[PDB]
């Protein structure tokens, strides 16, 4: 028989932020030492890997708002 | 027989933040030391891995609001 | 029989941010030492890998808002 | 009248060490964080000072034997 | 009247060391962070000072034996 | 009256070392971060000062034996 | 609803002085001595300050009458 | 509704002085001595300051007869 | 909505002074000594300062009558 | 009859002082006030006079030894 | 009859001082005030006079030793 | 009869001073005020006079030693 599919997501949305001031932010890691030694590693699909990282991150987005959507239809 | 599917999510929404001031934030890890040694690792699908990480993070978004949605239809 | 598919996402959305001032941000790593030694690595598909990283990152986007969408229809 | 002083230490002495191997010694300081805050330093005689030092020492003498002697005569 | 002094120390002494091997010695400082804050420094006699040092030392003498002697006569 | 001084130290003394091999010695400082802040310095007599040093030393003498003597006679 | 404010202060007043003579006034300060010692001054807001002053004042107004008035209305 | 503000201060006032003579006024400071010692001064906002003054002053107004009035209305 | 504001200060005021004579005023400072000593003078906003002044002043205004008024309306 | 007078005083004397060091002296008079009121000052023979003085004296002689003698003969 | 006078005073005398150092001496008068009032002065023989002085003296003689003598014979 | 007078004073005397160093002497009068008021000043013989002085004196003689003598004979 006849198959009728209607997919219509409707969105009216606002992700909003107001900040009078961002500042006077201090992040103070002292340099550093790292060592990695390896024989066999076997990564086969979508593998995300961090080994021996010594990461310092400072992230001050004035907004930093995120909107994420996934729309999927399968037949 | 005939199949009729209607998918219509309707969204009217606001994610909001108001701040007079963000500031005077201090973060103080001592530098650092890391060692990793490996023989055999076997990651086969979507594996997310951190080994021996020494990560310092400072994250001060003025907003930082998140809106996340998933819409999925399957036949 | 006849198959009719209608896919029509409708979106009116705003990711917005107002900041009066971004400033006086200090991030203070002093260099460093890194060593990596390897024999066999076997990365086969979509593998993302970081080994022995010593990353200092400073990121101050005036906005930094993100809107991400994925739309998929499969038959 | 007569004063006679005779002084005579006689020393036969041996300070000895034997070691088969001085090795596989690891000194791996994990970093550190130090802060000092002051009004005045006002150092007027024979002051020895360290302020905010973060000093690492590794000392592996193959012998490291010490012999110390003092002879003093006063009249 | 007569004063006679005889001062005659006699020394036979040996400071000795035997080592089969000095090695495989690692000194690997993980960095570090130091801060010092002051108004005045006012150093007026024989002051020895270190301010804010971050000093690494590796000292592996094959012998490193020490002999110290002092002889003093005062009249 | 007569003053007679006779001063005769006699020394046969040996500071001696054997090492079969010096080697495979690693000195690997992971950097570092130092800050010093002041208004005035006022150093007036015999002052020894180090400010903000970041000093790495490696010292591997094949002998490194020391013998020190002082002889003083005062009238 | 309707709001009516009527503010009507009425002032009929006299500040009066009669003097047969203002005079034969002697101010003869006998000199003086003042000493002040300090490390730092750190003035951050609205200070009215006098430090170590030795100030002589003679003030002889013939009338010197003072009238001070304030009228304030807020809505 | 209708807002009506009427502000009508009425002032008839006299500050009056009668003096038969202003005079024969002597101000004769016997000198003086002042000393001030400091290291740093850090004035950041609206400071009115006098340091180490030896200020003499004579003020003989014939009237000297001040009237001060504000009138403020705010909406 | 409908507003009215009416402001009508009516002032008939007089500062009056009668003096038979202004005179025979002597200001005779016997000198003086001032010393002021400092390292740094950081003045950052609206600062009024006097340092080490030896200031003599004389005033003999014939009237010196003062009338000060301020009229302020804000909406 | 015949008169014989012999006047022969003999003086052998020493006025001595030994000082290692003279110093660190402050004389800081706090000002002062004097008034003296008189009619007639008839001074007729050998008068030494001070009237209404305000005198300050500082006297630090390295020796300051005084020897005074008087020898008088009358017939 | 015959008059014989012998007047023969004999002096061998020493006024002595030894000083290692004179110094660091301070005199700081705080001004002062003096008034003197008289009708008549009538000084008739050998008068020494001071009237109304305000005198400051600093006197630091490296010796300042004094030897004073009078030798008088009258007939 | 015959008059024989012999006046023969014999003097061998020394005023001595030894100083290793003269220095660092400070004299700083803060002014002062003097007034003197008189009608008639009749001074008739050997008068020494000071009226209304305001004198500052600094005297640092390297020796400043004084030897004073008076020798008088009358018949």
Curated annotation (Swiss-Prot), chains A, B, C, D, E, F, G, H, I, J, K, L:
Where are the N6,N6-dimethyllysine residues found in this chain? Answer: 8
Q: Can you tell me which residues are glycosylated? A: 44, 50, 66
Q: What is the effect of changing residue 2 to N?
A: In FTD1; minimal parkinsonism; very early age of onset
> Which residues does the UniProt site feature Not glycated point to?
8, 14, 18, 28, 37, 40, 67, 72
- Report the locations given in the UniProt record: Cytoplasm, Cytosol; Cell membrane; Cytoplasm, Cytoskeleton; Cell projection, Axon
Mutation: residue 34 to M; reported impact is: In FTD1; ultrastructural and biochemical characteristics indistinguishable from Alzheimer disease; accelerates aggregation of tau into filaments
Instruction: State which tissues express it.
Output: Expressed in neurons. Isoform PNS-tau is expressed in the peripheral nervous system while the others are expressed in the central nervous system.
Give start and end residues of every Tau/MAP repeat.
3-33, 34-65
**Record-listed Phosphoserine modification sites:** 2, 21, 49, 53
Cross-link for Glycyl lysine isopeptide (Lys-Gly) (interchain with G-Cter in ubiquitin), residue positions:
8, 14, 18, 28, 40, 44, 50, 66, 72
Q: From which domain of life does this come?
A: Eukaryota
Instruction: Give the range the annotation lists for the signal sequence.
Output: none
- N6-acetyllysine modification sites are 8, 14, 18, 28, 40, 44, 66
- Cite the post-translational modification comment: Phosphorylation at serine and threonine residues in S-P or T-P motifs by proline-directed protein kinases (PDPK1, CDK1, CDK5, GSK3, MAPK) (only 2-3 sites per protein in interphase, seven-fold increase in mitosis, and in the form associated with paired helical filaments (PHF-tau)), and at serine residues in K-X-G-S motifs by MAP/microtubule affinity-regulating kinase (MARK1, MARK2, MARK3 or MARK4), causing detachment from microtubules, and their disassembly. Phosphorylation decreases with age. Polyubiquitinated. Requires functional TRAF6 and may provoke SQSTM1-dependent degradation by the proteasome. PHF-tau can be modified by three different forms of polyubiquitination. 'Lys-48'-linked polyubiquitination is the major form, 'Lys-6'-linked and 'Lys-11'-linked polyubiquitination also occur.
Residues modified to Omega-N-methylarginine: 46
Q: What is known of its domains?
A: The tau/MAP repeat binds to tubulin. Type I isoforms contain 3 repeats while type II isoforms contain 4 repeats.
* Subunit structure as annotated in this protein's UniProt entry: Interacts with MARK1, MARK2, MARK3 and MARK4. Interacts with PSMC2 through SQSTM1. Interacts with SQSTM1 when polyubiquitinated. Interacts with FKBP4. Binds to CSNK1D. Interacts with SGK1. Interacts with PIN1. Interacts with LRRK2. Interacts with LRP1, leading to endocytosis; this interaction is reduced in the presence of LRPAP1/RAP.
Q: What does this protein do?
A: Promotes microtubule assembly and stability, and might be involved in the establishment and maintenance of neuronal polarity. The C-terminus binds axonal microtubules while the N-terminus binds neural plasma membrane components, suggesting that tau functions as a linker protein between both. Axonal polarity is predetermined by TAU/MAPT localization (in the neuronal cell) in the domain of the cell body defined by the centrosome. The short isoforms allow plasticity of the cytoskeleton whereas the longer isoforms may preferentially play a role in its stabilization.
Using the UniProt entry, name the condition the protein is associated with.
Answer: In Alzheimer disease, the neuronal cytoskeleton in the brain is progressively disrupted and replaced by tangles of paired helical filaments (PHF) and straight filaments, mainly composed of hyperphosphorylated forms of TAU (PHF-TAU or AD P-TAU). O-GlcNAcylation is greatly reduced in Alzheimer disease brain cerebral cortex leading to an increase in TAU/MAPT phosphorylations.
Instruction: Tell me the protein's name.
Output: Microtubule-associated protein tau
Q: Which organism is it from?
A: Homo sapiens (Human)
Taxonomically, what lineage is the organism? Eukaryota, Metazoa, Chordata, Craniata, Vertebrata
């Amino acid at each position: 028989g006849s198959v009728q599919i209607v997919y219509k997501p409707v969105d009216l949305s606002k992700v909003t932020s107001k900040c009078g001031s961002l500042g006077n932010i201090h992040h103070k890691p002292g340099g550093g030492q790292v060592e990695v030694k390896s024989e066999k590693l076997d990564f086969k699909d979508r593998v995300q890997s961090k080994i021996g990282s010594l990461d310092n991150i400072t992230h001050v987005p004035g907004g930093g708002n995120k909107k994420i959507e996934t729309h999927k239809l399968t037949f």
